[PDB]
Amino acid sequence: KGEELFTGVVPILVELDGDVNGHKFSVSGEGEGDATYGKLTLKFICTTGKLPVPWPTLVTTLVQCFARYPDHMKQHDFFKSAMPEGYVQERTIFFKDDGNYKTRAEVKFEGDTLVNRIELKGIDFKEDGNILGHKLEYNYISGNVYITADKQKNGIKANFKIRHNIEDGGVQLADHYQQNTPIGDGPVLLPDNHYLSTQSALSKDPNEKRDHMVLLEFLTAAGIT
Ligand SMILES: [Mg+2]
């Protein structure tokens, strides 16, 4: 039933409040999603001035309900099944040899618009590390989101590793642990193990002088034959 909500282009709003090593900031995002093609187009603006962390570190936090699930896998799409009431998405993201983000989001429809409201807390970051030192490249992120059922919470868990390109040539690893639980009381689709193949392309609006990120992203479910 929630799947019916994604047959066309859906407007998206993202609102994030964050606190990382003593710096509070906010991000607002707007765009649209077309789950038929697993396609997201989003623009994010830091509304408090300059972002105190690199934009690439926020991509995964800033709507997996827009994934393209192949027809033969549609019974494994937890995310859309929870709609319109939505789900809570929580993560801990461990930046190797550095701090961590803990995030909590509610993803739900407000009328015809899919809304992602997030709070983020970052702690134990190194002042001269890759994150607070702004040493990460701005280009591309990709990975496989490995999803498994969480029957006890009528939801899912997921885990994945992001390799953030460092300006010197190296890698900043970000290990993601994820839990999603439905907001509503109704049945959801509890999936077999599978993954979301995700590719995010980061760019800038040449005319935009606010601190911002333009994102073109594709997300496709896979791993069931
Ligand atoms: Mg490189």
Side-chain angles (χ1 to χ4, degrees), residues 151-179:
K151 289 196 147 60
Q152 286 204 237
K153 304 196 181 169
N154 204 32
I156 57 162
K157 288 177 196 309
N159 68 258
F160 52 102
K161 319 178 79 76
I162 295 305
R163 289 150 62 88
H164 290 293
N165 298 140
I166 303 172
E167 65 189 7
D168 74 0
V171 188
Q172 173 63 71
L173 300 174
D175 283 285
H176 287 63
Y177 295 83
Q178 178 175 333
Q179 59 185 33

PDB file of all heavy atoms in Angstrom, residues 151-179:
ATOM      1  N   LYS A 151      13.193  -8.724  13.315  1.00  0.00           N
ATOM      2  CA  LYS A 151      11.816  -9.130  13.629  1.00  0.00           C
ATOM      3  C   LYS A 151      11.327  -8.592  14.975  1.00  0.00           C
ATOM      4  O   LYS A 151      10.150  -8.255  15.125  1.00  0.00           O
ATOM      5  CB  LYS A 151      11.673 -10.655  13.574  1.00  0.00           C
ATOM      6  CG  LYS A 151      11.752 -11.212  12.155  1.00  0.00           C
ATOM      7  CD  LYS A 151      11.220 -12.641  12.055  1.00  0.00           C
ATOM      8  CE  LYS A 151      10.544 -12.911  10.714  1.00  0.00           C
ATOM      9  NZ  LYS A 151      11.458 -12.727   9.549  1.00  0.00           N
ATOM     10  N   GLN A 152      12.237  -8.488  15.937  1.00  0.00           N
ATOM     11  CA  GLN A 152      11.878  -8.034  17.287  1.00  0.00           C
ATOM     12  C   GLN A 152      11.395  -6.590  17.324  1.00  0.00           C
ATOM     13  O   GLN A 152      10.586  -6.233  18.182  1.00  0.00           O
ATOM     14  CB  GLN A 152      13.057  -8.188  18.236  1.00  0.00           C
ATOM     15  CG  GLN A 152      13.338  -9.626  18.643  1.00  0.00           C
ATOM     16  CD  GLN A 152      14.072  -9.709  19.969  1.00  0.00           C
ATOM     17  OE1 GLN A 152      15.153 -10.295  20.058  1.00  0.00           O
ATOM     18  NE2 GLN A 152      13.491  -9.111  21.010  1.00  0.00           N
ATOM     19  N   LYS A 153      11.883  -5.762  16.404  1.00  0.00           N
ATOM     20  CA  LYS A 153      11.429  -4.376  16.315  1.00  0.00           C
ATOM     21  C   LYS A 153      10.548  -4.136  15.091  1.00  0.00           C
ATOM     22  O   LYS A 153      10.219  -2.994  14.796  1.00  0.00           O
ATOM     23  CB  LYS A 153      12.623  -3.426  16.293  1.00  0.00           C
ATOM     24  CG  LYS A 153      13.558  -3.599  17.476  1.00  0.00           C
ATOM     25  CD  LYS A 153      14.501  -2.417  17.627  1.00  0.00           C
ATOM     26  CE  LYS A 153      15.450  -2.612  18.801  1.00  0.00           C
ATOM     27  NZ  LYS A 153      16.552  -1.607  18.820  1.00  0.00           N
ATOM     28  N   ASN A 154      10.146  -5.208  14.405  1.00  0.00           N
ATOM     29  CA  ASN A 154       9.317  -5.112  13.182  1.00  0.00           C
ATOM     30  C   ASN A 154       9.975  -4.180  12.163  1.00  0.00           C
ATOM     31  O   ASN A 154       9.298  -3.385  11.504  1.00  0.00           O
ATOM     32  CB  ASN A 154       7.896  -4.617  13.501  1.00  0.00           C
ATOM     33  CG  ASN A 154       6.875  -5.025  12.455  1.00  0.00           C
ATOM     34  OD1 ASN A 154       6.983  -6.089  11.834  1.00  0.00           O
ATOM     35  ND2 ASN A 154       5.854  -4.183  12.268  1.00  0.00           N
ATOM     36  N   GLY A 155      11.295  -4.295  12.051  1.00  0.00           N
ATOM     37  CA  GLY A 155      12.093  -3.414  11.229  1.00  0.00           C
ATOM     38  C   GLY A 155      13.278  -4.093  10.579  1.00  0.00           C
ATOM     39  O   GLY A 155      13.250  -5.309  10.272  1.00  0.00           O
ATOM     40  N   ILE A 156      14.318  -3.290  10.344  1.00  0.00           N
ATOM     41  CA  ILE A 156      15.521  -3.762   9.690  1.00  0.00           C
ATOM     42  C   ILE A 156      16.753  -3.206  10.381  1.00  0.00           C
ATOM     43  O   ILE A 156      16.679  -2.224  11.106  1.00  0.00           O
ATOM     44  CB  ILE A 156      15.577  -3.400   8.182  1.00  0.00           C
ATOM     45  CG1 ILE A 156      15.470  -1.891   7.934  1.00  0.00           C
ATOM     46  CG2 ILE A 156      14.489  -4.138   7.408  1.00  0.00           C
ATOM     47  CD1 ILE A 156      15.959  -1.473   6.557  1.00  0.00           C
ATOM     48  N   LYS A 157      17.873  -3.864  10.141  1.00  0.00           N
ATOM     49  CA  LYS A 157      19.184  -3.354  10.464  1.00  0.00           C
ATOM     50  C   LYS A 157      19.974  -3.303   9.183  1.00  0.00           C
ATOM     51  O   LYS A 157      19.692  -4.040   8.231  1.00  0.00           O
ATOM     52  CB  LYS A 157      19.897  -4.271  11.463  1.00  0.00           C
ATOM     53  CG  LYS A 157      19.335  -4.207  12.874  1.00  0.00           C
ATOM     54  CD  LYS A 157      20.058  -5.212  13.767  1.00  0.00           C
ATOM     55  CE  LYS A 157      19.312  -5.477  15.064  1.00  0.00           C
ATOM     56  NZ  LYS A 157      18.953  -4.211  15.764  1.00  0.00           N
ATOM     57  N   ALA A 158      20.970  -2.437   9.151  1.00  0.00           N
ATOM     58  CA  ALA A 158      21.872  -2.412   8.023  1.00  0.00           C
ATOM     59  C   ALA A 158      23.259  -2.007   8.467  1.00  0.00           C
ATOM     60  O   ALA A 158      23.450  -1.385   9.524  1.00  0.00           O
ATOM     61  CB  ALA A 158      21.354  -1.491   6.919  1.00  0.00           C
ATOM     62  N   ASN A 159      24.230  -2.445   7.682  1.00  0.00           N
ATOM     63  CA  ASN A 159      25.605  -2.046   7.890  1.00  0.00           C
ATOM     64  C   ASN A 159      26.324  -1.898   6.555  1.00  0.00           C
ATOM     65  O   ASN A 159      25.984  -2.545   5.555  1.00  0.00           O
ATOM     66  CB  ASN A 159      26.330  -2.999   8.840  1.00  0.00           C
ATOM     67  CG  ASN A 159      26.528  -4.370   8.260  1.00  0.00           C
ATOM     68  OD1 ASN A 159      25.803  -5.307   8.603  1.00  0.00           O
ATOM     69  ND2 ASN A 159      27.522  -4.509   7.393  1.00  0.00           N
ATOM     70  N   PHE A 160      27.289  -0.993   6.545  1.00  0.00           N
ATOM     71  CA  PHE A 160      28.091  -0.741   5.352  1.00  0.00           C
ATOM     72  C   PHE A 160      29.283   0.126   5.699  1.00  0.00           C
ATOM     73  O   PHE A 160      29.286   0.804   6.714  1.00  0.00           O
ATOM     74  CB  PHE A 160      27.277  -0.109   4.209  1.00  0.00           C
ATOM     75  CG  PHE A 160      26.492   1.117   4.595  1.00  0.00           C
ATOM     76  CD1 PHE A 160      26.946   2.394   4.265  1.00  0.00           C
ATOM     77  CD2 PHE A 160      25.264   0.999   5.240  1.00  0.00           C
ATOM     78  CE1 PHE A 160      26.203   3.528   4.605  1.00  0.00           C
ATOM     79  CE2 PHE A 160      24.523   2.129   5.582  1.00  0.00           C
ATOM     80  CZ  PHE A 160      24.996   3.391   5.264  1.00  0.00           C
ATOM     81  N   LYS A 161      30.284   0.078   4.836  1.00  0.00           N
ATOM     82  CA  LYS A 161      31.499   0.888   4.973  1.00  0.00           C
ATOM     83  C   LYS A 161      31.546   1.894   3.835  1.00  0.00           C
ATOM     84  O   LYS A 161      31.315   1.537   2.674  1.00  0.00           O
ATOM     85  CB  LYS A 161      32.757   0.009   4.917  1.00  0.00           C
ATOM     86  CG  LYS A 161      32.670  -1.309   5.672  1.00  0.00           C
ATOM     87  CD  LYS A 161      33.943  -2.140   5.511  1.00  0.00           C
ATOM     88  CE  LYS A 161      35.067  -1.659   6.422  1.00  0.00           C
ATOM     89  NZ  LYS A 161      34.865  -2.069   7.848  1.00  0.00           N
ATOM     90  N   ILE A 162      31.825   3.147   4.167  1.00  0.00           N
ATOM     91  CA  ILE A 162      32.054   4.176   3.168  1.00  0.00           C
ATOM     92  C   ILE A 162      33.539   4.505   3.204  1.00  0.00           C
ATOM     93  O   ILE A 162      34.107   4.701   4.278  1.00  0.00           O
ATOM     94  CB  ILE A 162      31.231   5.464   3.435  1.00  0.00           C
ATOM     95  CG1 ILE A 162      29.723   5.181   3.319  1.00  0.00           C
ATOM     96  CG2 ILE A 162      31.656   6.595   2.499  1.00  0.00           C
ATOM     97  CD1 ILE A 162      29.288   4.556   2.010  1.00  0.00           C
ATOM     98  N   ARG A 163      34.150   4.527   2.022  1.00  0.00           N
ATOM     99  CA  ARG A 163      35.533   4.969   1.850  1.00  0.00           C
ATOM    100  C   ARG A 163      35.517   6.399   1.303  1.00  0.00           C
ATOM    101  O   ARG A 163      35.233   6.633   0.125  1.00  0.00           O
ATOM    102  CB  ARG A 163      36.271   4.008   0.904  1.00  0.00           C
ATOM    103  CG  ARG A 163      36.552   2.654   1.535  1.00  0.00           C
ATOM    104  CD  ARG A 163      36.587   1.516   0.521  1.00  0.00           C
ATOM    105  NE  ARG A 163      37.640   1.655  -0.487  1.00  0.00           N
ATOM    106  CZ  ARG A 163      38.895   1.214  -0.370  1.00  0.00           C
ATOM    107  NH1 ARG A 163      39.317   0.600   0.734  1.00  0.00           N
ATOM    108  NH2 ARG A 163      39.744   1.401  -1.373  1.00  0.00           N
ATOM    109  N   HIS A 164      35.791   7.355   2.185  1.00  0.00           N
ATOM    110  CA  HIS A 164      35.896   8.762   1.813  1.00  0.00           C
ATOM    111  C   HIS A 164      37.276   9.042   1.303  1.00  0.00           C
ATOM    112  O   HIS A 164      38.236   8.864   2.034  1.00  0.00           O
ATOM    113  CB  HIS A 164      35.642   9.665   3.013  1.00  0.00           C
ATOM    114  CG  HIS A 164      34.213   9.672   3.495  1.00  0.00           C
ATOM    115  ND1 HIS A 164      33.213  10.183   2.765  1.00  0.00           N
ATOM    116  CD2 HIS A 164      33.648   9.235   4.692  1.00  0.00           C
ATOM    117  CE1 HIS A 164      32.058  10.065   3.451  1.00  0.00           C
ATOM    118  NE2 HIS A 164      32.329   9.491   4.631  1.00  0.00           N
ATOM    119  N   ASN A 165      37.368   9.498   0.054  1.00  0.00           N
ATOM    120  CA  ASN A 165      38.634   9.942  -0.559  1.00  0.00           C
ATOM    121  C   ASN A 165      39.243  11.125   0.182  1.00  0.00           C
ATOM    122  O   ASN A 165      38.581  12.147   0.400  1.00  0.00           O
ATOM    123  CB  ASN A 165      38.411  10.366  -2.022  1.00  0.00           C
ATOM    124  CG  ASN A 165      37.910   9.232  -2.898  1.00  0.00           C
ATOM    125  OD1 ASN A 165      37.040   9.427  -3.767  1.00  0.00           O
ATOM    126  ND2 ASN A 165      38.445   8.038  -2.671  1.00  0.00           N
ATOM    127  N   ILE A 166      40.511  10.989   0.551  1.00  0.00           N
ATOM    128  CA  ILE A 166      41.244  12.063   1.218  1.00  0.00           C
ATOM    129  C   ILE A 166      42.043  12.859   0.190  1.00  0.00           C
ATOM    130  O   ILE A 166      42.546  12.313  -0.791  1.00  0.00           O
ATOM    131  CB  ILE A 166      42.189  11.519   2.308  1.00  0.00           C
ATOM    132  CG1 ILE A 166      41.418  10.705   3.352  1.00  0.00           C
ATOM    133  CG2 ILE A 166      42.924  12.663   2.998  1.00  0.00           C
ATOM    134  CD1 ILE A 166      42.332   9.991   4.330  1.00  0.00           C
ATOM    135  N   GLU A 167      42.158  14.165   0.406  1.00  0.00           N
ATOM    136  CA  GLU A 167      42.839  15.021  -0.572  1.00  0.00           C
ATOM    137  C   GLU A 167      44.296  14.597  -0.853  1.00  0.00           C
ATOM    138  O   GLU A 167      44.772  14.764  -1.969  1.00  0.00           O
ATOM    139  CB  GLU A 167      42.723  16.505  -0.192  1.00  0.00           C
ATOM    140  CG  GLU A 167      43.420  16.895   1.102  1.00  0.00           C
ATOM    141  CD  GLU A 167      43.105  18.319   1.545  1.00  0.00           C
ATOM    142  OE1 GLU A 167      42.232  18.983   0.929  1.00  0.00           O
ATOM    143  OE2 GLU A 167      43.738  18.775   2.522  1.00  0.00           O
ATOM    144  N   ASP A 168      44.987  14.031   0.135  1.00  0.00           N
ATOM    145  CA  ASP A 168      46.360  13.517  -0.070  1.00  0.00           C
ATOM    146  C   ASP A 168      46.461  12.214  -0.893  1.00  0.00           C
ATOM    147  O   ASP A 168      47.548  11.844  -1.323  1.00  0.00           O
ATOM    148  CB  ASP A 168      47.103  13.350   1.276  1.00  0.00           C
ATOM    149  CG  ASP A 168      46.630  12.134   2.100  1.00  0.00           C
ATOM    150  OD1 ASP A 168      45.723  11.392   1.670  1.00  0.00           O
ATOM    151  OD2 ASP A 168      47.187  11.922   3.202  1.00  0.00           O
ATOM    152  N   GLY A 169      45.341  11.517  -1.087  1.00  0.00           N
ATOM    153  CA  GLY A 169      45.331  10.259  -1.835  1.00  0.00           C
ATOM    154  C   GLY A 169      44.785   9.068  -1.056  1.00  0.00           C
ATOM    155  O   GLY A 169      44.345   8.085  -1.663  1.00  0.00           O
ATOM    156  N   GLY A 170      44.803   9.150   0.280  1.00  0.00           N
ATOM    157  CA  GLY A 170      44.334   8.048   1.147  1.00  0.00           C
ATOM    158  C   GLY A 170      42.822   7.858   1.267  1.00  0.00           C
ATOM    159  O   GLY A 170      42.058   8.343   0.428  1.00  0.00           O
ATOM    160  N   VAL A 171      42.408   7.136   2.316  1.00  0.00           N
ATOM    161  CA  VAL A 171      40.996   6.814   2.588  1.00  0.00           C
ATOM    162  C   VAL A 171      40.623   7.079   4.051  1.00  0.00           C
ATOM    163  O   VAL A 171      41.323   6.637   4.958  1.00  0.00           O
ATOM    164  CB  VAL A 171      40.689   5.317   2.333  1.00  0.00           C
ATOM    165  CG1 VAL A 171      39.191   5.069   2.422  1.00  0.00           C
ATOM    166  CG2 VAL A 171      41.225   4.855   0.984  1.00  0.00           C
ATOM    167  N   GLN A 172      39.509   7.772   4.277  1.00  0.00           N
ATOM    168  CA  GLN A 172      38.913   7.859   5.605  1.00  0.00           C
ATOM    169  C   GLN A 172      37.719   6.915   5.610  1.00  0.00           C
ATOM    170  O   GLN A 172      36.734   7.147   4.921  1.00  0.00           O
ATOM    171  CB  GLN A 172      38.461   9.290   5.927  1.00  0.00           C
ATOM    172  CG  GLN A 172      37.684   9.459   7.224  1.00  0.00           C
ATOM    173  CD  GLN A 172      38.500   9.107   8.456  1.00  0.00           C
ATOM    174  OE1 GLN A 172      39.419   9.835   8.820  1.00  0.00           O
ATOM    175  NE2 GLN A 172      38.156   7.999   9.112  1.00  0.00           N
ATOM    176  N   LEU A 173      37.830   5.852   6.388  1.00  0.00           N
ATOM    177  CA  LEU A 173      36.757   4.874   6.512  1.00  0.00           C
ATOM    178  C   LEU A 173      35.681   5.396   7.432  1.00  0.00           C
ATOM    179  O   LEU A 173      35.980   5.966   8.484  1.00  0.00           O
ATOM    180  CB  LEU A 173      37.290   3.561   7.076  1.00  0.00           C
ATOM    181  CG  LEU A 173      38.377   2.924   6.211  1.00  0.00           C
ATOM    182  CD1 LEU A 173      38.960   1.696   6.905  1.00  0.00           C
ATOM    183  CD2 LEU A 173      37.833   2.574   4.837  1.00  0.00           C
ATOM    184  N   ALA A 174      34.430   5.156   7.045  1.00  0.00           N
ATOM    185  CA  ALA A 174      33.277   5.473   7.870  1.00  0.00           C
ATOM    186  C   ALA A 174      32.394   4.229   7.903  1.00  0.00           C
ATOM    187  O   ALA A 174      31.786   3.861   6.899  1.00  0.00           O
ATOM    188  CB  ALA A 174      32.530   6.687   7.320  1.00  0.00           C
ATOM    189  N   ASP A 175      32.373   3.565   9.052  1.00  0.00           N
ATOM    190  CA  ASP A 175      31.597   2.350   9.260  1.00  0.00           C
ATOM    191  C   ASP A 175      30.232   2.690   9.837  1.00  0.00           C
ATOM    192  O   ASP A 175      30.127   3.254  10.937  1.00  0.00           O
ATOM    193  CB  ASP A 175      32.354   1.410  10.203  1.00  0.00           C
ATOM    194  CG  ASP A 175      33.488   0.684   9.499  1.00  0.00           C
ATOM    195  OD1 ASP A 175      33.206  -0.252   8.718  1.00  0.00           O
ATOM    196  OD2 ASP A 175      34.660   1.039   9.730  1.00  0.00           O
ATOM    197  N   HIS A 176      29.196   2.316   9.087  1.00  0.00           N
ATOM    198  CA  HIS A 176      27.820   2.665   9.364  1.00  0.00           C
ATOM    199  C   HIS A 176      27.083   1.490   9.936  1.00  0.00           C
ATOM    200  O   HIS A 176      27.111   0.411   9.355  1.00  0.00           O
ATOM    201  CB  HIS A 176      27.118   3.045   8.064  1.00  0.00           C
ATOM    202  CG  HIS A 176      27.525   4.387   7.490  1.00  0.00           C
ATOM    203  ND1 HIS A 176      28.792   4.665   7.066  1.00  0.00           N
ATOM    204  CD2 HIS A 176      26.768   5.541   7.251  1.00  0.00           C
ATOM    205  CE1 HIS A 176      28.824   5.930   6.581  1.00  0.00           C
ATOM    206  NE2 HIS A 176      27.585   6.462   6.701  1.00  0.00           N
ATOM    207  N   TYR A 177      26.431   1.702  11.073  1.00  0.00           N
ATOM    208  CA  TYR A 177      25.476   0.751  11.655  1.00  0.00           C
ATOM    209  C   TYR A 177      24.123   1.434  11.707  1.00  0.00           C
ATOM    210  O   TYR A 177      24.018   2.567  12.183  1.00  0.00           O
ATOM    211  CB  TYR A 177      25.916   0.339  13.057  1.00  0.00           C
ATOM    212  CG  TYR A 177      27.205  -0.420  13.028  1.00  0.00           C
ATOM    213  CD1 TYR A 177      28.425   0.253  12.987  1.00  0.00           C
ATOM    214  CD2 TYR A 177      27.214  -1.799  13.004  1.00  0.00           C
ATOM    215  CE1 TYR A 177      29.617  -0.439  12.927  1.00  0.00           C
ATOM    216  CE2 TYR A 177      28.401  -2.506  12.957  1.00  0.00           C
ATOM    217  CZ  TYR A 177      29.598  -1.818  12.919  1.00  0.00           C
ATOM    218  OH  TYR A 177      30.780  -2.492  12.866  1.00  0.00           O
ATOM    219  N   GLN A 178      23.092   0.735  11.243  1.00  0.00           N
ATOM    220  CA  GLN A 178      21.791   1.341  10.977  1.00  0.00           C
ATOM    221  C   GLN A 178      20.676   0.475  11.515  1.00  0.00           C
ATOM    222  O   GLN A 178      20.735  -0.737  11.411  1.00  0.00           O
ATOM    223  CB  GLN A 178      21.625   1.500   9.454  1.00  0.00           C
ATOM    224  CG  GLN A 178      20.299   2.089   8.987  1.00  0.00           C
ATOM    225  CD  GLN A 178      20.278   2.305   7.488  1.00  0.00           C
ATOM    226  OE1 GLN A 178      21.326   2.494   6.860  1.00  0.00           O
ATOM    227  NE2 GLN A 178      19.082   2.280   6.901  1.00  0.00           N
ATOM    228  N   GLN A 179      19.655   1.112  12.069  1.00  0.00           N
ATOM    229  CA  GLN A 179      18.419   0.455  12.442  1.00  0.00           C
ATOM    230  C   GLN A 179      17.247   1.312  11.973  1.00  0.00           C
ATOM    231  O   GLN A 179      17.285   2.545  12.083  1.00  0.00           O
ATOM    232  CB  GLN A 179      18.358   0.123  13.934  1.00  0.00           C
ATOM    233  CG  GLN A 179      18.477   1.285  14.887  1.00  0.00           C
ATOM    234  CD  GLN A 179      18.524   0.819  16.332  1.00  0.00           C
ATOM    235  OE1 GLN A 179      19.058  -0.251  16.638  1.00  0.00           O
ATOM    236  NE2 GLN A 179      17.962   1.618  17.225  1.00  0.00           N
TER     237      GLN A 179
END
